[PDB]
Amino acid sequence: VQIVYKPVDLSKVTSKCGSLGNIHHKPGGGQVEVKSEKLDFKDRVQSKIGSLDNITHVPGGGNKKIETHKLTF
Amino acid sequence: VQIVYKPVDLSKVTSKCGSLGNIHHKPGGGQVEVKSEKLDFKDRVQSKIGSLDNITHVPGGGNKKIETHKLTF
Amino acid sequence: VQIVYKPVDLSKVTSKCGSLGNIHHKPGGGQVEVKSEKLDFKDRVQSKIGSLDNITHVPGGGNKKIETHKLTF
Amino acid sequence: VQIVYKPVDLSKVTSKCGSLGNIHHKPGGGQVEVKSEKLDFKDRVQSKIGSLDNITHVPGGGNKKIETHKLTF
Amino acid sequence: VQIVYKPVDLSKVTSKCGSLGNIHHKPGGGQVEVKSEKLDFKDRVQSKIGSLDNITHVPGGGNKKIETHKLTF
Amino acid sequence: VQIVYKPVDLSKVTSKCGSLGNIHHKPGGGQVEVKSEKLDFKDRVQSKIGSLDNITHVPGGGNKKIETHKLTF
Amino acid sequence: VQIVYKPVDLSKVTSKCGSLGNIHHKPGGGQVEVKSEKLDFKDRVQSKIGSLDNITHVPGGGNKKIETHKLTF
Amino acid sequence: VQIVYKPVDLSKVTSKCGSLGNIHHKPGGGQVEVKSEKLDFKDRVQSKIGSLDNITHVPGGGNKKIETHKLTF
Amino acid sequence: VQIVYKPVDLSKVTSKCGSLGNIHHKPGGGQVEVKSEKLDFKDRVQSKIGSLDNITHVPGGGNKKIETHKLTF
Amino acid sequence: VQIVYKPVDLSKVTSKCGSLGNIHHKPGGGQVEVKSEKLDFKDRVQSKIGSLDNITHVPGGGNKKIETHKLTF
Amino acid sequence: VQIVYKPVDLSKVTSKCGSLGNIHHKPGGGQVEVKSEKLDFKDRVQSKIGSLDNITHVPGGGNKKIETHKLTF
Amino acid sequence: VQIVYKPVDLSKVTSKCGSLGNIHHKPGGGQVEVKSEKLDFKDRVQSKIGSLDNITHVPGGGNKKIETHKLTF
Amino acid sequence: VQIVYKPVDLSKVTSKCGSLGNIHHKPGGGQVEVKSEKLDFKDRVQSKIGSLDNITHVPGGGNKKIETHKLTF
Amino acid sequence: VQIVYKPVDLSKVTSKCGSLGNIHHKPGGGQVEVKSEKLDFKDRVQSKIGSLDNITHVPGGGNKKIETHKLTF
Amino acid sequence: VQIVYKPVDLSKVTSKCGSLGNIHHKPGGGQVEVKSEKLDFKDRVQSKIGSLDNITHVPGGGNKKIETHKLTF
Amino acid sequence: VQIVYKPVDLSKVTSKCGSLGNIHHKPGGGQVEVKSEKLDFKDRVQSKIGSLDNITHVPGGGNKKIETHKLTF
Amino acid sequence: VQIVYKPVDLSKVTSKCGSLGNIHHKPGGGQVEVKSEKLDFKDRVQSKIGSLDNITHVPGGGNKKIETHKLTF
Amino acid sequence: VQIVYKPVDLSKVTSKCGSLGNIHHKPGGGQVEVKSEKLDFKDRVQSKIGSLDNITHVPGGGNKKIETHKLTF
Amino acid sequence: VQIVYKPVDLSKVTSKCGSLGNIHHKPGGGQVEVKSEKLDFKDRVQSKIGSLDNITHVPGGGNKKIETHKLTF
Amino acid sequence: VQIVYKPVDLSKVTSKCGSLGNIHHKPGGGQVEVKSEKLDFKDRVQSKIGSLDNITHVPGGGNKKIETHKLTF
Amino acid sequence: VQIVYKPVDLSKVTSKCGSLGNIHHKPGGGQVEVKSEKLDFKDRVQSKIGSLDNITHVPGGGNKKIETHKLTF
Amino acid sequence: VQIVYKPVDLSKVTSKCGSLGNIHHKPGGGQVEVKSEKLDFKDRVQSKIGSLDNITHVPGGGNKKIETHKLTF
Amino acid sequence: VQIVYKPVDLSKVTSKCGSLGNIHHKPGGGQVEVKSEKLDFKDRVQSKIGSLDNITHVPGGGNKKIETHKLTF
Ligand SMILES: FCCC1CCN(c2ccn3c(n2)nc2ccccc23)CC1
Ligand SMILES: FCCC1CCN(c2ccn3c(n2)nc2ccccc23)CC1
Ligand SMILES: FCCC1CCN(c2ccn3c(n2)nc2ccccc23)CC1
Ligand SMILES: FCCC1CCN(c2ccn3c(n2)nc2ccccc23)CC1
Ligand SMILES: FCCC1CCN(c2ccn3c(n2)nc2ccccc23)CC1
Ligand SMILES: FCCC1CCN(c2ccn3c(n2)nc2ccccc23)CC1
Ligand SMILES: FCCC1CCN(c2ccn3c(n2)nc2ccccc23)CC1
Ligand SMILES: FCCC1CCN(c2ccn3c(n2)nc2ccccc23)CC1
Ligand SMILES: FCCC1CCN(c2ccn3c(n2)nc2ccccc23)CC1
Ligand SMILES: FCCC1CCN(c2ccn3c(n2)nc2ccccc23)CC1
Ligand SMILES: FCCC1CCN(c2ccn3c(n2)nc2ccccc23)CC1
Ligand SMILES: FCCC1CCN(c2ccn3c(n2)nc2ccccc23)CC1
Ligand SMILES: FCCC1CCN(c2ccn3c(n2)nc2ccccc23)CC1
Ligand SMILES: FCCC1CCN(c2ccn3c(n2)nc2ccccc23)CC1
Ligand SMILES: FCCC1CCN(c2ccn3c(n2)nc2ccccc23)CC1
Ligand SMILES: FCCC1CCN(c2ccn3c(n2)nc2ccccc23)CC1
């Protein structure tokens, strides 16, 4: 039995910008209320219970390249 | 038995912009109310219970290239 | 038995823009109410129970290229 | 037995724009009410129970190219 | 037995625009009410129970090219 | 036995526009009420129970090209 | 046995427009009421129970080209 | 039995920007309230119960390249 | 039995920027309240109960390259 | 039995910036209150109960390269 | 049985910056209150109960390269 | 000259009801448009130009008694 | 000259009700548009230009008694 | 000359109710637009230009008694 | 000349209620827009230009008694 | 000349209630926009330009008695 | 000339209530925008330009008695 | 000439209540924006330009008695 | 000439309450922005330009009695 | 000429309360911004420009009695 | 000429309370920004420019009695 | 000419309280910024420019009695 | 000419309290910044420029009685 695995990749994820500019993020605070009694979490459970979050993500150049090579017998 | 795997990729995910400009995000805070009794989470469960979230994602250049190579016997 | 797998790809996902401009996002906060008793989640379940979320996604250049190569015996 | 797999692709998903312009998103907050008793989720179930969400997606250049190569024996 | 698979593709999904212009989205918040007792979800079920959502998708250049190559024995 | 599969495609899905213009979307919020008791969903069921949604999709250049190549033995 | 499959396609789905213009969408919110008791969904069933939705789809250039190549033995 | 695994990658995730500009993040503090009785967490569970968080992520140049090579016998 | 594992990688995750600029982060302090009785955490559980956190991450040049090589017998 | 493991990597995670600029972080102190009775932590549990934290991370040049080589018999 | 393990790495995590600039961090002191009764910690548990912490991390040049080589029999 | 004015009134405007009951008012929002150029109002003029009004007047007991006594010389 | 004015009134405007009941007012928001150029109001003029108003007046007991006594020489 | 003015009034505007009940007012927000150029108001003019108002007046006991005594020479 | 003015009033504006009950006022926020150029107000003019107001007036016992005694020579 | 002014008043504006009850006021925030150029106000003019106001007036016992005695020569 | 002014008043504005109850006021924050150029106010002018105000007036016992005695020669 | 002024008043503005109860006021912060150029105020002008105010006035016993005695020659 | 002024007043503004109760005021901080150029105030002008104020006025017993006696020659 | 001024007042502004109770005032800090150029104040002008103020006025017994006696020749 | 001025006052502004109770004032610090150029104040002008003030006024017994006696010739 | 001025006052501003109780004032420090250029103050002008002040005024017994006697010729 | 001035006052401003109790004042330090260039103060001007002050005024018995007697010729 013979196996060959030679994937070739040559990619350019380019990102050119002159100038983003004046970005404003002025949220008004709200109100959040959560009421529970019992929590039982197991086996890779990620939770977010009760949140008032503000994020201003302004990256000059945003590029994500994902490659998942796999091989099984 | 013989196997060959030589996928060739040559791609340019280009992104050109002169200038984004004046971006404004001025939300007014609302109200959220959640009421529960029991929670039972298992086996890769991700939850978001109660949220008032504001996000201003302004990346100059947004490009995501996903490649999933697989091979099984 | 002989197998050959040589897919060739050469693609340019171009994106040219002069200037986005003045983008405004001024939402008025509403009201959300959720009432439950019992939750039982399992086996790759993602939930969003109760949310008042505002997002302003303004990426200069948006391009996503997905390739899923597979091969099984 | 002999197998050959040489798909050739050469595509340009072009996107040219001079300037988007003045985009405004001014929603008025409404009201949402959800009432349940029991939830039982399993086996790749994604839910959204109770939401008042506003999104302003303004990407300069929007282009998604999907290719799903498969081969089975 | 002999098999050959050489599909050739050469396509240009062009998109040219001078300027989008002044786009306005000013919805008035309504009211939504959902009342249930029991939920039982399984095996690739995605639900949206109770929503008041506003989206302003204004991408300069919108082009999606889908190719699904398959081959089975 | 011999098999040949060489489909050739060369297509240009062009889209030219000078300027979209002033687009306005000013809906008045209505009222929605849904009342149920039991839900039992299985095997690739996607539902939308209770919604008051407004969308303003204004892409400069809208072009989708779908190709589904298949081959079975 | 011999098989040949060489379909040739060369098509231009052109779309030229000078300027769309002033498009207005001003709906008045109505009222919707749905009343049920039991729901049992299975095997690729997609439902929309209770909706008051407004959409303003104004793409400069709308062109969709679908090709379904098939071959079976 | 023979196995070969020589994947070649040569990719440039470029990110060019002239100047980001004046970015402002002025959120108004809201209110969050969470009430529970018992918590039972196990086996890779990460939770966030009660949060009012503001983040201003402005990286000049944002590029993440992920490669997951795997091989099993 | 013979095994070879020679993956070659040559990638440049470049990030060029002229000058970020004047970045301001002026949040207004809110209020957070969490009330529980018993906590039982085990087996790789990370929690964040009660937080009012502000972060201004402004790295000139942000680039993360992840490679996970694996091999099992 | 023979095994070879010679992965070659040659990557440059470059980060060039002219000058970050005037970065300001002026948060207003909020209020946090957490109330519990009993805590029982075990087996790699990291918690953060009650926090009002401000961080201004401004590194000139941010680049993290992670490589996880593994091999098992 | 023979085993070879010769991974070669040659990477330059460069970070160039002209001058960071005037960075200001002027937080306003808030208030934090935590109330508990009993704590029981064991087996690699790190906790942070009650904190009002301010950090200004401004390193000229931030670059972390992690390599985890492993080999087991 | 002699004048006498002694009007005697003794009236009971009774209103008895056991229970009104379940009264529902669920109008569907219409559309109104008024276009004018000049308005000139004087000397006890009350106007209502442009209205979409809903009123649910349910008074338990409705009784109005009007008496206009007058006398002139 | 002699004048006498002795009007006697003895009236009971009674209103008895056991219980009003469940009154519901669920209007759907419409749309109103008014366009004018010049307004000139004088001398006891009350106007209402542009209104979308909902009122639910449910007074237990509604009784108004008006008496206008006058006398002139 | 002689004048006498002795009006006698003895009235009971009674209002009895057992219990109003469950009153609900759930309007859906509409849209109002008013456009003018010049306004000139004088001499006891009260105006309401542009309004979306909701009122729920539920007074237990509503009774207004008006008496206007006048006398002139 | 002789004048006498002895109006006698003896009135009981009674208001009895057992219990109002559960009153709910859940309006959905609409949208209001007013556009003018010049305003000239004089001589007892009260205006309300642009309003989205919600009022829930629930007074236990509502009774207003107005008496306007006048006398002139 | 002789003048007499002896108006006698003896009135009881009673208001009895057992218990108001559970009153809820949950409005959803809308949006208001007013645009003017010049304002000229004089001589007892009270204005309200631009308002989104919510009031919950629940006085146990509401009774206003107005008496305007006047006399002129 | 002789003048007499002896108005007698004996009034009881009573207000009895057992218990108001659970009153809730949970408004959702909206958005207000006012734009003007010049303001010229004189001679007893009170204005309110731009307001988002919430008031919960719950006085146990509300009674206002106004008497305006006047006399002129 | 003779003048007499002996107005007699004997009034009891009573207010009895057993217990107000649980009153809650949880508004969600909105957003207000006012833009002007010149202000010219004179001669008893009180203004409120730009306000987001919340008031919870809960006085046990609210009673205001106003008497304005006047006399002129 | 003779003048007499002997107004007699005997009034009891009573206020009785058993116990107010649990009053809560939990507003969510909004956002206010005011922009002007010139201010010119004179002659008894009181202004409030820019305010985000919260007040919880809970006086046990609220009673204000105003008497304005006047006399002129 | 003779003048007499003997106004008699005998009033009891009583205020009785058993116990106020648990009063809570937990506002969330918002954001205020005021921008002006020139201020010119004269002749009894009191201003408040820029304020984020919280007051909890809880006086046991609130009673203000104002009397303004005047007399002029 | 003769003048007499003998106003008699005998008033008891009583205030009785059993016990105020547990009063809490926990505001969250906001943010205030004021920007001006020139200030010119004269002739009894009191100003407050820029303030974030919290006051908890809890006086057991609050009673203010104001009397302004005046007399002029 | 004769003048008499004998105003008699006999008033008891009583204030009785059993015990105030547990009063807490826990504000969270905010942020204040004021920017000016020139200040010119004259003729009884009191100003407060820039303040973050907390006051807890809890006087057992608060009573202020003001009397302003005046007399002029 | 004769003048008499014999105002008699006999007032008791009483203040009785059993015990104030546990009063706590725990403010969190904020931040204040004031920036000016020139100050010119004259003629009874008192200013407070830049202050972060905390005061806990708890006087057992607070009573201020002000009397301003005046007389002029
Ligand atoms: F289960 C706990 C972890 C989950 C929930 C929290 N995360 C996110 C991530 C992104 N978004 C988001 N939430 N809400 C969003 C609203 C609009 C746009 C993007 C949004 C991470 C995943
Ligand atoms: F089942 C939970 C996940 C589902 C439901 C939520 N998602 C979406 C995505 C898109 N849209 C949407 N909802 N509503 C829409 C209305 C108009 C236009 C687009 C819309 C993701 C899929
Ligand atoms: F089952 C849960 C996931 C489903 C339902 C939600 N999604 C969508 C997507 C698009 N639209 C939509 N809903 N409603 C629409 C109305 C008009 C136009 C487009 C619309 C995603 C699929
Ligand atoms: F369990 C006790 C040890 C834990 C908790 C404390 N640590 C940290 C570390 C980083 N961050 C953080 N906390 N909070 C953050 C908020 C924003 C951004 C970064 C933040 C170390 C890990
Ligand atoms: F000119 C400005 C003042 C006018 C117009 C507004 N008012 C009203 C009052 C009552 N109704 C009404 N409008 N429309 C109605 C429709 C049905 C039933 C009753 C209605 C007060 C008087
Ligand atoms: F000119 C400015 C003042 C006018 C107009 C506004 N007012 C009102 C009052 C009552 N109603 C009303 N408008 N519209 C209504 C619709 C149905 C029922 C009652 C209604 C007060 C008078
Ligand atoms: F000109 C500025 C002052 C005017 C207009 C505003 N006021 C009101 C008062 C009452 N209502 C009202 N408006 N609209 C209403 C709709 C339905 C029912 C009652 C209504 C006070 C008078
Ligand atoms: F001109 C500036 C002063 C005017 C306008 C503002 N005021 C009010 C008062 C009462 N209402 C009202 N507006 N709108 C209303 C809608 C429904 C019911 C009652 C209403 C006070 C008078
Ligand atoms: F001109 C500046 C002063 C005016 C306007 C502000 N005031 C008010 C007072 C009462 N209300 C009101 N506005 N709007 C209202 C809506 C519904 C019910 C009552 C309302 C005081 C008078
Ligand atoms: F011109 C500057 C002074 C004016 C305006 C501010 N004041 C008020 C007073 C009361 N209310 C109000 N505004 N808005 C309100 C809304 C609903 C109910 C009551 C309301 C005092 C008078
Ligand atoms: F011109 C500067 C002085 C004016 C404006 C500020 N004042 C007030 C007073 C009371 N209220 C108010 N504003 N807004 C309110 C909203 C609802 C209820 C009551 C309200 C005092 C008078
Ligand atoms: F011009 C500078 C002096 C003026 C403005 C500041 N003052 C006040 C006083 C009372 N209130 C208020 N403002 N805003 C309020 C909102 C709701 C209720 C009461 C309110 C004192 C008078
Ligand atoms: F011009 C500088 C002096 C003025 C302004 C400052 N003062 C006040 C006084 C009282 N309040 C207030 N401001 N704001 C308030 C908000 C709600 C309730 C009461 C309020 C004193 C007078
Ligand atoms: F011009 C400089 C002197 C002025 C301003 C400062 N003073 C005050 C006094 C009282 N308050 C206040 N400010 N702000 C307040 C907010 C709520 C309640 C009461 C308040 C004294 C007068
Ligand atoms: F101009 C310089 C002298 C002025 C300003 C400083 N003083 C004060 C006095 C009282 N208060 C105050 N400031 N701010 C306050 C906030 C809330 C309550 C009371 C307050 C004395 C007068
Ligand atoms: F101009 C320099 C002298 C002035 C300013 C300083 N003084 C004060 C006095 C009292 N207070 C105050 N400042 N700030 C306060 C805040 C809250 C309550 C009371 C306060 C004395 C007068």
Side-chain angles (χ1 to χ4, degrees), chain W residues 8-46:
Chain W
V8 178
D9 170 68
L10 192 168
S11 305
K12 53 190 292 182
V13 188
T14 303
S15 300
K16 289 175 64 179
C17 184
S19 59
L20 306 177
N22 53 323
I23 295 167
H24 301 258
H25 192 202
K26 299 187 179 60
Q31 189 135 3
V32 178
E33 194 283 338
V34 182
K35 191 182 302 308
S36 59
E37 204 175 347
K38 298 185 180 182
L39 282 62
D40 305 325
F41 299 170
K42 265 183 286 177
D43 192 335
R44 284 186 293 265
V45 38
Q46 66 191 236

Side-chain angles (χ1 to χ4, degrees), chain L residues 48 53-55, chain M residues 45-48 53 55, chain N residues 46-48:
Chain L
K48 199 187 186 190
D53 301 353
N54 314 122
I55 169 161
Chain M
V45 38
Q46 66 191 236
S47 64
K48 199 187 186 190
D53 301 353
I55 169 161
Chain N
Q46 66 191 236
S47 64
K48 199 187 186 190

Side-chain angles (χ1 to χ4, degrees), chain R residues 1 5 10 12 14 31-32 36 40-41 47 64 70-71:
Chain R
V1 179
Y5 182 94
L10 192 168
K12 53 190 292 182
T14 303
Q31 189 135 4
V32 178
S36 59
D40 306 325
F41 298 170
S47 64
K64 50 188 70 176
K70 191 185 291 296
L71 178 48

Side-chain angles (χ1 to χ4, degrees), chain K residues 21-71:
Chain K
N22 53 323
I23 295 167
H24 301 258
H25 191 202
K26 299 187 179 60
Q31 189 135 3
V32 178
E33 194 283 339
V34 182
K35 191 183 302 309
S36 59
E37 204 175 347
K38 298 185 180 182
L39 283 62
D40 306 325
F41 299 170
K42 265 183 286 177
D43 192 335
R44 284 185 293 265
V45 38
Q46 66 191 236
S47 64
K48 199 187 186 190
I49 301 177
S51 64
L52 197 166
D53 301 353
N54 314 122
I55 169 161
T56 301
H57 194 193
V58 184
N63 312 122
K64 49 188 70 176
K65 190 179 184 302
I66 303 175
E67 291 184 350
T68 301
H69 290 272
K70 191 185 291 296
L71 178 48

Side-chain angles (χ1 to χ4, degrees), chain E:
Chain E
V1 179
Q2 181 178 6
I3 305 292
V4 183
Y5 182 94
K6 182 175 176 293
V8 178
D9 170 68
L10 192 168
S11 305
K12 53 190 292 182
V13 188
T14 303
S15 300
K16 289 174 64 179
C17 184
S19 59
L20 306 177
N22 53 323
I23 295 167
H24 301 258
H25 191 202
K26 299 187 179 60
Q31 189 135 3
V32 178
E33 194 283 339
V34 182
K35 191 183 302 309
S36 59
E37 204 175 347
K38 298 185 180 182
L39 282 62
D40 306 325
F41 299 170
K42 265 183 286 177
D43 192 335
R44 284 185 293 265
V45 38
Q46 66 191 236
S47 64
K48 199 187 186 190
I49 301 177
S51 64
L52 197 166
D53 301 353
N54 314 122
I55 169 161
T56 300
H57 194 193
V58 184
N63 312 122
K64 49 188 70 176
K65 190 179 184 302
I66 303 175
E67 291 184 350
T68 301
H69 290 272
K70 191 185 291 296
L71 178 48
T72 307
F73 242 78

Side-chain angles (χ1 to χ4, degrees), chain T residues 5 7 9 15 21-23 25 27 29 32 34 36-37 39-41 44 52 54 56 58 60-61 65 67 69, chain U residues 6 8-11 16 20 24 26 28 31 33 35 37-38 40 43 51 53-55 57 61-62 66 68:
Chain T
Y5 182 94
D9 170 68
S15 300
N22 53 323
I23 295 167
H25 192 202
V32 178
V34 182
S36 59
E37 204 175 347
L39 282 62
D40 305 325
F41 299 170
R44 284 186 293 265
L52 197 166
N54 314 122
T56 301
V58 184
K65 189 179 184 302
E67 291 184 351
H69 290 272
Chain U
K6 182 175 176 293
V8 178
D9 170 68
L10 192 168
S11 305
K16 289 175 64 179
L20 306 177
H24 301 258
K26 299 187 179 60
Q31 189 135 4
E33 194 283 339
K35 191 182 302 308
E37 204 175 347
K38 298 185 180 182
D40 305 325
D43 192 335
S51 65
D53 301 353
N54 314 122
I55 169 161
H57 194 193
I66 303 175
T68 301

Side-chain angles (χ1 to χ4, degrees), chain A residues 34-60:
Chain A
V34 182
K35 191 183 302 309
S36 59
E37 204 175 347
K38 298 185 180 182
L39 283 61
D40 306 325
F41 299 170
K42 265 183 286 177
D43 192 335
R44 284 185 293 265
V45 38
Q46 66 191 236
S47 64
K48 199 187 186 190
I49 301 177
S51 64
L52 197 166
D53 301 353
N54 314 122
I55 169 161
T56 300
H57 194 193
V58 184

